[PDB]
Amino acid sequence: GSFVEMVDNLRGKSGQGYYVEMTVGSPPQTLNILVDTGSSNFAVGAAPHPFLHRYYQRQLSSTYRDLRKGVYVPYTQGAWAGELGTDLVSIPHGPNVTVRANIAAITESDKFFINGSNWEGILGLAYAEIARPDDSLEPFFDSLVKQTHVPNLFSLQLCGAGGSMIIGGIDHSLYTGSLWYTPIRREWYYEVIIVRVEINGQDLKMDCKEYNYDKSIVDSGTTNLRLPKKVFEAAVKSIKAASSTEKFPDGFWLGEQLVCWQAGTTPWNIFPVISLYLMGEVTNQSFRITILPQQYLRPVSQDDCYKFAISQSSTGTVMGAVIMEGFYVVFDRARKRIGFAVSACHVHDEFRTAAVEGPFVTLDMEDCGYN
Ligand X SMILES: C[C@@H](NC(=O)c1cc(COC(=O)[C@](C)(N)Cc2ccccc2)cc(N(C)S(C)(=O)=O)c1)c1ccc(F)cc1
150 vs 292, which CB is nearer to ligand X? 292
Element (H or E) spanning 241, and its range? Answer: helix 229-242
The footprint of ligand X on this chain (CB under 6 A) covers a number of residues equal to: 23
Give the three-state DSSP class for 130: helix
Comparing CB distances to ligand X, the nearer of 47 and 97 is: 47
Q: Which of residues 31-60 bind ligand X (CB under 6 A)?
A: 34, 36, 38-39
| 218 interacts with ligand X by CB under 6 A | no
Q: Would you say 58 and 89 are in contact if contact means Cβ atoms under 8 Å apart?
A: no
Q: Which of 40, 90, 157, 223 binds ligand X (CB under 6 A)?
A: 223
In terms of phi and psi (left: phi > 0; alpha: psi -120 to 50; beta: otherwise), the region of 118 is: left
Q: Is 243 or 311 the residue whose CB approaches ligand X more closely?
A: 311
When asked if residue 112 is in the footprint of ligand X (CB under 6 A), the reply is yes
Shortest CB 34 distance to ligand X, Å: 6
Comparison of 118 and 284: residue with beta carbon closer to ligand X: 118
CB under 6 A: which stretch of 57-65, 73-81, 204-212, 340-348 binds ligand X? 73-81
Amino acid (1-letter code) at residue 138: E
Task: Rule CB under 6 A: say whether 120 interacts with ligand X.
Answer: no
Per CB under 6 A, the list member of 29, 90, 311, 343 interacting with ligand X is 311
Catalytic residue check, 219: yes
Task: Decide whether 111 or 205 has the Cβ nearer to ligand X.
Answer: 111
The CB-nearest residue to ligand X is: 221
Evaluate whether 150 touches 97 at the Cβ level (below 8 Å).
yes
Using CB under 6 A as the binding rule, the residues of this chain from 7 to 36 that contact ligand X are 15-18, 34, 36
Beta bridge partners of 217: 191, 318
Query: Of 18 and 328, which CB lies nearer to ligand X in the complex structure?
Result: 18
Instruction: Tell which positions 141-200 bind ligand X, by CB under 6 A.
Output: none
Q: Which residues lie across from 191 on neighbouring strands?
A: 217
Q: Which of 87, 142, 171, 219 is catalytic?
A: 219
* Catalytic member of 8, 36, 207, 304: 36
Whether 250 is a known active-site residue: answer no
Could you tell me the CA-to-CA distances from 254 to 310, 332, 368 in Å, in that order? 8, 34, 27
Question: Do the Cβ atoms of 277 and 308 come closer than 8 Å?
Answer: no
Residue of the chain from 10, 321, 323, 329 that contacts ligand X (CB under 6 A): 321
Minimum distance from residue 263 beta carbon to ligand X (Å): 22
For ligand X, which is the closer residue by CB, 38 or 94? 38
The Cα–Cα gap between 88 and 49 comes to: 24
Work out whether 280 is an interface residue with ligand X (CB under 6 A): no
Strands 121-124 and 317-319: unpaired
Strands of the 297-299 sheet, one edge to the other: 259-262, 303-308, 297-299
Helix (H, G, I), strand (E, B) or coil at 153: coil
Distance separating alpha carbons of residues 41 and 127, to the nearest angstrom:
9
Shortest CB 137 distance to ligand X, Å: 16
Beta pairing partners, 328: 157, 341
Query: Which residues does 371 contact at the CB level (< 8 Å), separation at least 6?
Result: none
Closest CA to 163 of 93, 264, 90, 268: 93
The reply to whether 221 sits near ligand X by the rule CB under 6 A is yes
Q: Minimum Å distance from CB 311 to ligand X? A: 4
d(CA 200, CA 198): 6
Stretch of 2-10, 215-223, 326-334, 347-355 contacting ligand X, by CB under 6 A? 215-223
Q: What residues are paired with 274 via a beta bridge?
A: 199, 291
Report the first-to-last Cα separation within the chain, whole angstroms: 42
CB of 313 to ligand X, least distance (A): 7
Rounded to whole angstroms, the Cα distance separating 366 from 371 reads: 11
Q: Which one of 219, 290, 343, 354 is in contact with ligand X (CB under 6 A)?
A: 219
Q: Which of residues 74-103 bind ligand X (CB under 6 A)?
A: 75-78
Query: What residues are annotated to the active site?
Result: 36, 219
Positions in the binding site for ligand X (CB under 6 A): 15-18, 34, 36, 38-39, 75-78, 112, 122, 219, 221-224, 226, 311, 320-321
